[PDB]
Amino acid sequence: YQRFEQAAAFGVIASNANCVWIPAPGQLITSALEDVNIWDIKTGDLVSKLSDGLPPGASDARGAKPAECTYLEAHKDTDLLAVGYADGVIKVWDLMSKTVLLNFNGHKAAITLLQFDGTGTRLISGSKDSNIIVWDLVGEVGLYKLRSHKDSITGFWCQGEDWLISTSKDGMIKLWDLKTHQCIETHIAHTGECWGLAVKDDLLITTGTDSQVKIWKLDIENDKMGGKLTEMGIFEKQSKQRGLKIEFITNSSDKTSFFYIQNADKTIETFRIRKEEEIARGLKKREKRLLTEEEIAKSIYSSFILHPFQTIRSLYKIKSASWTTVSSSKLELVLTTSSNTIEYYSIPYEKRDPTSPAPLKTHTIELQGQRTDVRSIDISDDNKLLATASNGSLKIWNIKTHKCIRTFECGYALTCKFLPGGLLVILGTRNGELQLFDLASSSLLDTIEDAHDAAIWSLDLTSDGKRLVTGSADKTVKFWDFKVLKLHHDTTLELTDDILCVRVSPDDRYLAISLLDNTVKVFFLDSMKFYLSLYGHKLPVLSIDISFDSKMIITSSADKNIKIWGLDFGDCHKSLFAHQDSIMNVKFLPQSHNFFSCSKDAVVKYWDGEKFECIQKLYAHQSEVWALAVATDGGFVVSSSHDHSIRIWEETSLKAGERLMEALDLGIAEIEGLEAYNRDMKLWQRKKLGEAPIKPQGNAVLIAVNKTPEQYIMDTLLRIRMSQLEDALMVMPFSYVLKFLKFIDTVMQNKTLLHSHLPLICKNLFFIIKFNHKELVSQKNEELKLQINRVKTELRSALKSTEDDLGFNVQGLKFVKQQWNLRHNYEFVDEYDQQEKESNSARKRVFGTVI
Amino acid sequence: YNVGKAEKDGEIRLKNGVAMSKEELTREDKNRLRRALKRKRSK
Amino acid sequence: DGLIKCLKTLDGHNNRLWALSTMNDGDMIVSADADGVFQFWKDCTEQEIEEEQEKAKLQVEQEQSLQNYMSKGDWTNAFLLAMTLDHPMRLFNVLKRALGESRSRQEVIFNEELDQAISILNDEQLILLMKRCRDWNTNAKTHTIAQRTIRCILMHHNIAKLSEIPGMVKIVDAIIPYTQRHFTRVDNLVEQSYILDYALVEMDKLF
Amino acid sequence: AGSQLKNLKAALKARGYDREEKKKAIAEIREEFNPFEIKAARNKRIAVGKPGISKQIGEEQRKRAFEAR
């Protein structure tokens, strides 16, 4: 088969991520969906779209959504870009050659921050699962995983090798000793979430849910447990929403610091922090009226040391920001907003006055976007493309360059079409208005106010183009002719129900209209004849398509399935269930019975109309695919979605016993090696110090598991099971029994792991010598005789030491119970009433017996 | 006397004897103890 | 009764009720009357969640303190924080670690600072400590830690106090027979520990 | 060696809203894991017949011959 693929994607400038700024104002790296694009603020031309080397839609593209980019981060000097995606992976690229250097999957959910540290070679990454991982770049390895937060890492701040400090989407800020990787000090920052973190070395600043911004003093050289990071006071903002990024600078040329808190909505609150001279010369002024009350006033600091500044607003909702500074009169701040647009503002400040009632944007890159989701896409014969938006941004892109060359202002526009000669656009809006535009001249040929009483929903030209059909939610369809280049309403068909799709056949034959009442009706255009009524879809029914032979129609709806109908008798053929949310649009190919359907769950799907298979399952969008349009000839198809994207699609095993034996042999070899080393040390310290042994290096596996040999043998002796322990001890020969006795003799000098394994040592040792008693008492060596005596003394001392406190506790606890009894048990002198009282007050337990 | 279940609700008391507190268990042992309780319910 | 919107029913009175006067400052003191008996309901949600969030703040500080003590060593203040937070597995770990290092180094069975810290805890703390010792004593493994803790309680507290604490007989009657079971088992271990002595007398008869 | 059930579960994990792939896979595993409708001899130096299919064509042939007579 001649399958499909993706040629190019565009329409996005700023997506659901952050932005990094690079100096030459300068350029900007930001996110498109799953690929990063670089822009020069000066002009705004797309100078780079760094993308994955595999086209989404190819043979090896995997069966899921692609990983949306979610955090840009840049190493300036050594020229790297660490970008991180929504599945958790981190790709590190060199910006010179634009290839992938490092892949750093690691995480389990989407990631929220990156940071290079010690400028090169180290990258720390925080994610929507609460881990935060340190990575080395010279080893390609996750070094450390700091794991104690609970919800989602909202920010952190590190210095090199000793201290990190993170704050997460619970209420908690944490300080991490990066030598031990244990959390040192934990506070509750804000009572809900904690969304911000910034610090200029003395003061730390955090923000939470609503306007309460908290100043902290971190004293890194502190020694107390609670008090490495203390809280110094709160203050307020003007926004009652989530401040979610704070960032600082030190402008030179005096020395000064500025920080911003961007908000959820539309607003960045900028702040100047002042200097120690005006701290000292402002302290007395609030210390006026002359001291317990004045000390309470001086303690209740934030408004003192912090100074608000020019509160920069924007038109849309703010997603990310970053700035640069010179002279303290060029706080030059780039800002990517949600409705895709970047904006380069710059506030001046004459070091006392900010010299403006409201700041000024110096650049704005917004030409290659829409600011809303494209509710309708269209195409020329083959050359141009039509994108229809809610703000009014009709845009005429071109296929061969992916640049909008022509754009207008219409309104809440949901459907549009071209006109068959090209260079002319019809469009209908969500109120009762229709509009006409062109390509060479300006916007409005004419608008028709009161084109319909209510929301228009779908229009269609005839194949010659002179006559178009508009169906609207005022329960009417209308017909319009082109009189000479103006619209002529002549007839109108009022239905009982809100018509929401129209279509004609591609040979002027049928008019199929989709009603809100779960059905479609097929009419004859030449008679308004009411040929057919196709029924049985069971929810209101979206896009129709008529085939090129005018024999076969498709019918999409919100029932998550498309139905194929034969138009000769109105008989159904398939009812194939696609698309688990809602099929928004469905379109045939030009010459074939193959078709495409794009749906509300971020997927387009390629089907055939003969076997009714799914030919292909294309997976490049991220959100609700609102429209798609096929070429008139040739058959390449464009699809446009809710993530502001427009994309083209073209054609192409030991056991117990022997484990204990090998553990015993290496353990006792290490043990008597160290004992020979100690005898060598005593002889070369008691004799002429001219020589000694060189070095016994400790065993590989013993230093690899970090265990003394007694502990190594002790845990493998633990790890054999009780059912095969009497076999594990019976398999081993008498030489291993003798070195087992050496092992027990050494282990009851370390009285820590003697007392934690007393019954195990007793059981194993007594079975060993009880089984090997005949040979043991025939061995003739005073070393083993002294060994047995030493083991006997230390073992029996440990056992009598534990049963001493056992017997003590028995007699003490029964004394306690008995003195409680003789204090207040009861008063019976008569033995029969006494025994009946004790029988009524006894402990009962009921048992299931068999008779 | 035999070690039943805990008389609190932030506590987990196995019949071994080892009482664990839910505020002191990490999330790995929380998932592991939940699956183990699911096994002992399912039998 | 009076009910609020739906959640948070109020205790009300015994019988019928034609009364609601809630209209002080924002919605300040509410008054509600039965046949005769009045009720004066207090305030807005402004401090009963503040004391809850500040005890959450205190608890998350002392939990981190307990983690730092358990890491760096320091078993006495770790013990009293585990007893204050009631973290029983951590309490078993601090007692087991301190007991093992007590066997290592060298009247006193833990270190002196920790068994003084056991000597100065009050009634409900030692009743939860002895409940922990009760259900550790049911093992034959974790029973030595329970016996050392029972022993230091017995030799550092007053026996009349320990008897007259309400609840200290349903615990000590639970753990007398388990200590007797362990006494029988360890005594039989000492009994069968004399095969070493028999093997030594054979090894000396060997010449 | 290993069970026909274990090999059948392995074949289902091997083969894994298309229809004809499932028609092909189901027919393939049916005519593979049905060994009693072929006949196999032993090569003294192997599917040598299809008994049920030969039987049904030999009896349908004489069935239509009998109805014709």
Curated annotation (Swiss-Prot), chain A:
CC per GO annotation: 90S preribosome; nucleolus; nucleoplasm; Pwp2p-containing subcomplex of 90S preribosome; small-subunit processome
Signal peptide region: none
SMART domains in UniProt: WD40
Stretches that traverse the bilayer: none
Main location as per UniProt: nucleus
Keyword annotations of the record: Nucleus, Repeat, Ribonucleoprotein, Ribosome biogenesis, rRNA processing, WD repeat
InterPro entries: G-protein_beta_WD-40_rep, SSU_processome_Utp12, TBC1_cilium_biogenesis, WD40/YVTN_repeat-like_dom_sf, WD40_repeat_CS, WD40_repeat_dom_sf, WD40_rpt
Residue ranges of coiled coil: none
Gene3D superfamilies: YVTN repeat-like/Quinoprotein amine dehydrogenase
Localisation: Nucleus, Nucleolus
Protein's job: Involved in nucleolar processing of pre-18S ribosomal RNA.
Family: Belongs to the WD repeat WDR3/UTP12 family.
Note: Present with 9620 molecules/cell in log phase SD medium.
PANTHER family, alphabetized: WD REPEAT CONTAINING PROTEIN 3 WDR3, WD REPEAT-CONTAINING PROTEIN 3
Annotated protein name in UniProt: U3 small nucleolar RNA-associated protein 12
Organism: Saccharomyces cerevisiae (strain ATCC 204508 / S288c)
UniProtKB/Swiss-Prot annotation, chain B:
Domain of life: Eukaryota
Subcellular location: Nucleus, Nucleolus
Transmembrane segments: none
Quaternary organization: Component of a heterotrimeric complex containing IMP3, IMP4 and MPP10. Interacts with snoRNA U3. Component of the ribosomal small subunit (SSU) processome composed of at least 40 protein subunits and snoRNA U3. Interacts with the SSU processome subunits EMG1, IMP3, IMP4, KRR1, NOC4/UTP19, NOP1, RPS4A, RPS4B, RPS6A, RPS6B, RPS7A, RPS7B, RPS9A, RPS9B, RPS14A, RPS14B, UTP1-UTP18, UTP20-UTP22 and UTP25.
Family, similarity comment: Belongs to the MPP10 family.
Function according to Swiss-Prot or TrEMBL: Involved in nucleolar processing of pre-18S ribosomal RNA. Required for the early cleavages at sites A0, A1 and A2 during 18S ribosomal pre-RNA processing.
Protein name: U3 small nucleolar RNA-associated protein MPP10
Organism of this sequence: Saccharomyces cerevisiae (strain ATCC 204508 / S288c) (Baker's yeast)
Organismal lineage: Eukaryota, Fungi, Dikarya, Ascomycota, Saccharomycotina
Swiss-Prot record, chain C:
Subcellular location: Nucleus, Nucleolus
Domain of life assignment: Eukaryota
Quaternary state and interactors: Interacts with snoRNA U3. Interacts with MPP10. Component of the ribosomal small subunit (SSU) processome composed of at least 40 protein subunits and snoRNA U3.
Covered range of the whole protein: 596 to 817 of 817
Organism of this sequence: Saccharomyces cerevisiae (strain ATCC 204508 / S288c)
Disulfide bonds: none
Job description of the protein: Involved in nucleolar processing of pre-18S ribosomal RNA.
WD repeats: 13-51, 61-102
Protein name: U3 small nucleolar RNA-associated protein 13
Bilayer-spanning residue ranges: none
Residues of the signal peptide: none
Note, other: Present with 8070 molecules/cell in log phase SD medium.
Curated annotation (Swiss-Prot), chain D:
Compositional bias (Basic and acidic residues): 17-22
Annotated spans, Disordered: 41-62
Compartment(s) where it occurs, according to its Swiss-Prot or TrEMBL record: Nucleus, Nucleolus
Disulfide bond residue pairs: none
Family from the record: Belongs to the NOP14 family.
Assembly behavior: Interacts with snoRNA U3. Interacts with EMG1, MPP10 and NOC4. Component of the ribosomal small subunit (SSU) processome composed of at least 40 protein subunits and snoRNA U3.
Function: Involved in nucleolar processing of pre-18S ribosomal RNA. Has a role in the nuclear export of 40S pre-ribosomal subunit to the cytoplasm.
Protein name, entry field: Nucleolar complex protein 14
